[PDB]
From a paper:
The [name]-dependent kinase [name] (DDK) regulates DNA replication initiation by phosphorylation of the [name] double hexamer ([name]-DH) to promote helicase activation. At early G1 phase, when the DDK ([name]-dependent [name] kinase) and S-CDK (S-cyclin dependent kinase) kinase activities are low, the origin recognition complex (ORC) together with Cdc6 and Cdt1 load the Mcm2-7 helicases onto origin DNA to form an inactive [name] double hexamer (DH) encircling dsDNA to license replication. During this process, DDK and S-CDK, act in concert with various origin-firing factors to convert the DH into two active Cdc45-Mcm2-7-GINS (CMG) helicases which then serve as scaffolds for the assembly of bidirectional replisomes. Compelling evidence in budding yeast has also shown that the essential role of DDK in DNA replication is to relieve an inhibitory effect imposed on replication initiation from the N-terminal serine/threonine-rich domain (NSD) of Mcm4 (residues 74-174), as NSD deletion can bypass DDK function.
Based on the occupancy of the two symmetrical DDK binding sites on the DH and the general stability of DDK (stable DDK vs stable [name]-NTD), the particles of these two subsets could be divided into six groups, representing major compositional and conformational populations of DH-DDK assemblies in the reaction. Groups IV and V, showing one DDK bound to the DH, account for 44.5% of the total particles; whereas Group VI (11.3%) represents DHs without DDK bound. Consistent with previous data that the DH structures with or without DNA bound appeared almost identical, our structures, at much-improved resolution, confirmed that DDK binding and phoporylation did not induce obvious structural changes to the DH.
Residue numbers in the entry:
A (entry chain F): 101 to 199, 260 to 433, 441 to 467, 498 to 763
B (entry chain D): 176 to 733, 739 to 784, 788 to 853
C (entry chain 5): 2 to 110, 129 to 223, 233 to 304, 319 to 340
D (entry chain G): 189 to 564
Amino acid sequence: KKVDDVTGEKVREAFEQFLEDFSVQSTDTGEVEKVYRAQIEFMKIYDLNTIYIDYQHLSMRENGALAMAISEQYYRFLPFLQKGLRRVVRKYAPELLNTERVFQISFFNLPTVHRIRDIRSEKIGSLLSISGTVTRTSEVRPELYKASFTCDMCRAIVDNVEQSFKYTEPTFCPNPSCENRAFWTLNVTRSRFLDWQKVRIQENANEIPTGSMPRTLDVILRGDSVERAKPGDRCKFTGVEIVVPDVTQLGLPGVKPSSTLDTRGISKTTEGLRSLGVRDLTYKISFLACHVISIGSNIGERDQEVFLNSLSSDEINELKEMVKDEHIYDKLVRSIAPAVFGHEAVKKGILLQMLGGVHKSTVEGIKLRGDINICVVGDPSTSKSQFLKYVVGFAPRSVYTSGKASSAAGLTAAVVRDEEGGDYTIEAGALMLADNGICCIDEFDKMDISDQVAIHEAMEQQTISIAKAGIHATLNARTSILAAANPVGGRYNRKLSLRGNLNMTAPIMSRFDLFFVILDDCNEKIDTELASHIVDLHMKRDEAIEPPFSAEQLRRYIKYARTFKP
Amino acid sequence: PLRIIWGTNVSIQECTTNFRNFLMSFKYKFRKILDEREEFINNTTDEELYYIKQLNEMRELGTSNLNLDARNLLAYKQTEDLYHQLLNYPQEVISIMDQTIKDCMVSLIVDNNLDYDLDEIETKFYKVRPYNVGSCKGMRELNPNDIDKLINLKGLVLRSTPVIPDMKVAFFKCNVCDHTMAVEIDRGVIQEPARCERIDCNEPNSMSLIHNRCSFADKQVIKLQETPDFVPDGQTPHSISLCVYDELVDSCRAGDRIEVTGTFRSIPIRANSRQRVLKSLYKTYVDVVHVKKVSDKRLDVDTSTIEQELMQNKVDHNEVEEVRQITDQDLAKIREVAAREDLYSLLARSIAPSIYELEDVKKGILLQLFGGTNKTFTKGGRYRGDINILLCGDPSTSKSQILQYVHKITPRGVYTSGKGSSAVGLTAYITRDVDTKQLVLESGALVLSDGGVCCIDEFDKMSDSTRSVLHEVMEQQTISIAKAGIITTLNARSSILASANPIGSRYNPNLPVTENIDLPPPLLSRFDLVYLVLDKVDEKNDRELAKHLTNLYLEDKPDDVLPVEFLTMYISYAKEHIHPIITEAAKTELVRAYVGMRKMGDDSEKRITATTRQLESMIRLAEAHAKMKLKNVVELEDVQEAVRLIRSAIKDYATDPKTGKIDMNLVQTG
Amino acid sequence: SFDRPEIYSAPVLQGESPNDDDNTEIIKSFKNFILEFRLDSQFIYRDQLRNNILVKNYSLTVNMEHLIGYNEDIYKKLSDEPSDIIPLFETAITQVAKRISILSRAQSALNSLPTFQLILNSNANQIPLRDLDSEHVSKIVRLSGIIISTSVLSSRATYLSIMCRNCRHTTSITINNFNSITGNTVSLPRSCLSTIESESSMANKKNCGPDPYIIIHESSKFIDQQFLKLQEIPELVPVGEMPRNLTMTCDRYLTNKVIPGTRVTIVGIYSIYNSKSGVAIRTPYIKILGIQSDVETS
Amino acid sequence: TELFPPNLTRRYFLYFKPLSQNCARRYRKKAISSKPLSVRQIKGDFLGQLITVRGIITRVSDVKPAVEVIAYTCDQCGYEVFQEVNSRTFTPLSECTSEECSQNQTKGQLFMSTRASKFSAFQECKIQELSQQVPVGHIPRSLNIHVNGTLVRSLSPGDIVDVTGIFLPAPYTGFKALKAGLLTETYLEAQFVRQHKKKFASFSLTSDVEERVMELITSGDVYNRLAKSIAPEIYGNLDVKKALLLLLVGGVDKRVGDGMKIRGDINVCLMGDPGVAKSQLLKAICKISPRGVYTTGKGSSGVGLTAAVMKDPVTDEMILEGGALVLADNGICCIDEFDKMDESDRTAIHEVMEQQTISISKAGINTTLNARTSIL
Ligand SMILES: Nc1ncnc2c1ncn2[C@@H]1O[C@H](COP(=O)(O)OP(=O)(O)OP(O)(O)=S)[C@@H](O)[C@H]1O
Ligand SMILES: Nc1ncnc2c1ncn2[C@@H]1O[C@H](COP(=O)(O)OP(=O)(O)OP(O)(O)=S)[C@@H](O)[C@H]1O
Ligand SMILES: Nc1ncnc2c1ncn2[C@@H]1O[C@H](COP(=O)(O)OP(=O)(O)OP(O)(O)=S)[C@@H](O)[C@H]1O
Ligand SMILES: [Mg+2]
Ligand SMILES: [Mg+2]
Ligand SMILES: [Mg+2]
Ligand SMILES: [Zn+2]
Ligand SMILES: [Zn+2]
Ligand SMILES: [Zn+2]
Ligand SMILES: [Zn+2]
């Protein structure tokens, strides 16, 4: 008979008791409602496979021992959690069990979120939260969850054999026909599969240490969590730290653990006619996330009816209050980039760039661009980079690039060789990460001419073409461009035209809707208030900034206004 | 008789007794008389028990690591042989030392009848970290007979691998009866059980290893660029791999200069992945025991760049110090020196004693070392008090020596040359790792110099594309990379110190200042201080300079200047603990000075007109001057000194505002 | 064009504690029994071994009841599983004899010394031939009867030097076990051993073929094997039954020590062979360990 | 009994110094070992012989531990098992082979120990045929030299040397299809090295040196005698040769306690009309100096001056390989056609001439490297 895990049994009983017994008082009325029975009866209506459990609710139970036991040994106690959930669902909603439905528990609201560099080996097999920027996402793929095999010489079917990460074969064979355990074959049709996605995440910019390069991590999404991560956004993943075999570590210094088979209780004879197998224990840390939540890429869905339903009634009141204002335009144009003193025309253009225009298509099939491209040119130290830094900080789905530091593949899309393996991948460039957003290109004049060619291909075509190696693809590049440029010779020449001052290509220049030339003229009064404003900023930090609208309400108003199609 | 570990000359009992006697009886006066320092002996520091004090404070803070100076072992008479045994046989001697530390830990609380519980001490594992084990010999000068010996290496960290899980206990489960066992690793080998150990179940080949149930330890590989004291003929710098384990993982960042002491190890490498055939030529590496990130000769790292790193250091309990410790007596000396009326001249004069005069240049260099205050907005903005200096000058003006001194004095800067650097080599690139055959990301010179000073010699000779990289570094203190490998924003909070020549290689008074400097206005506006270092021939100046250079060669080894250790710790304390703020009287005269120089720029390029970045530079220099005098506020005189330094650096008094020319005789005073 | 690497060892540490079931400890106990046993006042087996080396008789004759007097556990091991224990005692005899074959001929003024043969006599209870059972299989049995036929001497290989047919790889095989009947328990290897050894650095797909080795007869060594047939004595046979007999094998000094018609006691291993009447039926036979002639014909 | 063999108890390395030509002349002995051969003349019939090859060293690998015999410990029997290694690859011993485990039914498991195993300091060097040795219209050829034991670090790139060693065959490297029979690679296992030019740092005040130095002093007028004998086939130019001798000697290197350094090396430019034999003077100085490297204005590029990141396959690692300035470290760099150089090489020598370092910050590398050349 099988031996059981007594601690796992206590975990199972405590968790299944938690699934009913936990309750909260109602905010509106004060009624004692039990949220997880409501959750299960809600999943029974819509056939959901995923139950969401707050970690604080689990932490309230007992003295906190159940939460600590679940978080510390999540990999060990997870099948017990599954069995407890199956029994609780059986007690109340037996119809969920029939279609066997694979259940997934998603934990969220962990007290701390860990940096990608804070990952250590003692947390392997433990529930934990990480945050990171999604750079690459893979196709949704099937994973062998419950395989079906036939013994090669028995030729009888067996099913529901559990797979523990790497592919396994059974050695039991309860069919009495054979005396051979090792030999099997696997059929793919009768096997049961699960959804699988590998998304690559990167260290956030503020999380990176002083001189280090960013490091990546491959996190696996399964079930309903698949496709909730998108390239170029900041995501918080809650899940288990797992470990994955890695043949890369062969040439590394240090003693690599190996695994020999022990031969002490085997009787042998030297009859004649000494080979043994040893396997490497080399691994890398990965993540298996049960829950994915997308934090805003900013510091702080096309239909308006969908958007207003997300907002609460009190915030809809504030939105309609902002709409009701007769001077709303003046408040908006003064709320754009409050650190910049003056330059109302550039703030107007940036606000209109964030709002944008409608995308229209003729009967021929020609697409009319609704994105508005702005280029800011002028004398040095005219706060041109301040506008771009404000836009990338405030606007969602916005990237900031420099002209010299960028590359043609880094701006649009790159085909990447991974681990010298035969597969090739695509990583999205800056304009793809800013799709339906703003790409801020500072120092536009310093960029290479071939990069300018590669970008205006997307500027007319609104698309990016890939024909390198065996990968052919058409990718969307529906992005607005906010560019900052310096004239030839540093200073802007009044005598010359706009084309004389700019080194940029004429197809670059034709697509820009607005060219804002900001000139530096030395007047005593304007310099006086500008110097006073700058020293007051340095003196007073945040409270020297007085916008009519805060960043959150400005962003809410812009998101509301983008729904309208004039 | 005497029991000796095979292959060693080490007796466990003798080593334990000698090391315990050393712990109980060592005083730092023994170290002083070993180093032939008799006049420096004082009572209250030396005649107290040193390692007893560290053991007491180590119990009180709850730390488990003891730092052992191996030179102290050579100071003590009975442990002179123990020093050679520790160097020759660190694997056994270090374990013996850990056992002796644990025995002294329990003995200190049993003997003194302290309230500390014995059980809490006994469950702790104590380990000692030896350091200063000998001279930093060249790593390529080591022989195969030096394998498994303790060595010192000075180096620069280029990159580190992510944290690697190294298996220590293996978890096996039976497939049929769910019976679990845990087997502990023995010398890199884990023995798989061929059969289930339970009396009921005896199925062969039924134990499967569960990879996520089993326990792991942290292992990290760091590429270190060695900087040895002695370099033989025609040797090129080489990078060595060093392995850190457990708490020392992620203690070292890329671009910092460290002292590594560790054991010299060699392993055979498998020729093929599928084959177990090993290569006969072994691969050498260092298993790191102790890391030192603090040098008395240079400044320490700016802690505002490593706040989260300090927090993670506290979490990991690595007990590695990024900053030097400030005692009460030397802090009192710092406060007394800050009260001197000649503090500015004393600090600037003590910068480069070998370099004669260049007083305003040294003052600007000192203010760059101090830096302005760093302001981080709660909304998300960031202001950095990083000061950029350009030294445009005639040949033979010690500016290369000045950049050399600053490169030596900074904790983690990088020294580069014009046309010896490219745009890619300054920011970041992709290389192929030798060990893993993988594409790995490696920082360029600007990212490596973050938190320090990047010195650029021959700045005028650098190409336009390479100089155009420095714009974002000089204004935002960051680089925004959008390439095939990375699309990210990297912090480069490096103050830039550049040295340059005029177009004709000598300053021409016929041409204006802007033509002589020959920089585009976007790049030249980002420099806080621009120094026109000129060679004026005088009787007294040439006589004094010639005497100053000839006094160097009177002896083989060559007013009052502060020592470099006290200078570094004073600047360190001021950067750490002084964050001055601008006041109203400073604000109004800042505004008045900026308006006045904008009015000077109204006159008719030939001249460098005033710009808003010059107002930012006035703010930063005033903050640096206030931080120098340990004042927590920026008031009017600091701003006047900043303005005066800006005027005197470019020699605005010497130049004619209308023409822009500089005349050598009529105002200039060398 | 480099030579073989050499593998060699030297004792340094004590190692794990010795175990009674380990082969080395059994060999050491056998060696101590040979050296230190006293019958009345003399080391009978040590002096017998010296005299046998002087006569160049490379065998030792051991009384089994002496093993009772000396050490019980190794007697139990020898009785229960003789096939594994007898090579160990033969190794012990050969190891003691090497010390005698060096310290004697170099003092009373090349030599190759073979593995000695264990001949062992018992005075215990004699099993009748028809009372043999499956419980006696692979165990030492003492039994009596009359010998009705002795075959001619066959030649078995002890040491043979073999050479690959086309590869010309040279190998030697040493055989110390001749207990098997109708079976080649040791034979020529099925493929050339040069490739798996990889002894030379050059290693000049080449396959030598199945059974490539050829015996070099002028450098091979041989012994004598004899088949005997033992019948139960005709005085005590059931009236209507044919008397039952057993095939027995002897080798080396046990051959030609008995003629047909002699009534003998025999110590030997009741053993098994398959002869090509039941799906799994094996014919019994005896591997002779000792022959005792009850009476001697004149 | 089993002992540690004498191979495991030897603390010394044994080398064969070749018999000299002068000593061989006395006894009418004809020394094959003494006569320096070019790389071309080392044929297959010289294999196994002690021979001397003269040539310039081009590449030297880093010193690495090459295991000669591997030591394993067995916990079961307490024996130490040693397996010899004579090839580039080996298979480690897994299961114990001592006499105690061999007889026993339970065989022990071997664990390798580095400290008990025997290593040799190993270097692989390339020696190239000298220009006078190369026949007409041919490319110089190279030979592999194996350096073991004490002789390591006695060969540096750019040295013209007599290397005496045993010419030995090696297992074949190359495509299997191209090989015909028992083809072998070749290498020279080094026994002795003699330097054609003695390094200045290797100078020691031996007894025989002292009488020659005293003779040169007591002859008198040493400064003019040494200066006028630098390039004696060149008429006149006495002050130029005097400054060239001062170039060879140089001033003292200055170290300040602050860490600031003032170079002791002298830099000399010779600019003049064509036909003043200044190229002859550069070649004369630059054969005289032990670490002299002769360069051309455009023949030596930027990467041929400073450094390049290249893979070393014998030690299997990417290392920095120096250019002409690194080859002349603590020597003289001999730059002919100085005005014909491009600006990048001018910046390189601009950093070299005062700071005596080359700072490279490219995609390949972020280093500073020592280039302590005196420049002519
Ligand atoms: N109108 C303004 N309002 C506020 N700050 C300003 C203004 N003009 C300049 N500044 C400040 O002056 C500095 C100029 O920085 P940048 O925005 O990088 O200048 P820029 O317009 O981008 O010119 P380049 O092309 O970078 S030289 C910053 O510290 C700005 O905050
Ligand atoms: N003012 C000075 N004080 C002290 N030493 C000096 C001074 N001026 C020149 N020297 C000495 O002369 C040497 C000349 O080197 P540097 O002055 O550093 O050259 P430089 O100023 O960088 O000019 P370059 O190399 O043509 S750009 C220095 O190394 C000092 O030894
Ligand atoms: N003073 C001299 N003594 C001896 N030979 C001389 C003298 N001047 C010139 N020659 C010879 O004239 C030739 C000049 O050769 P070079 O060494 O190339 O002169 P050069 O100064 O290098 O001229 P270049 O290369 O055109 S600048 C050689 O054959 C010299 O031997
Ligand atoms: Mg800008
Ligand atoms: Mg210089
Ligand atoms: Mg010439
Ligand atoms: Zn079957
Ligand atoms: Zn079991
Ligand atoms: Zn063969
Ligand atoms: Zn063994």
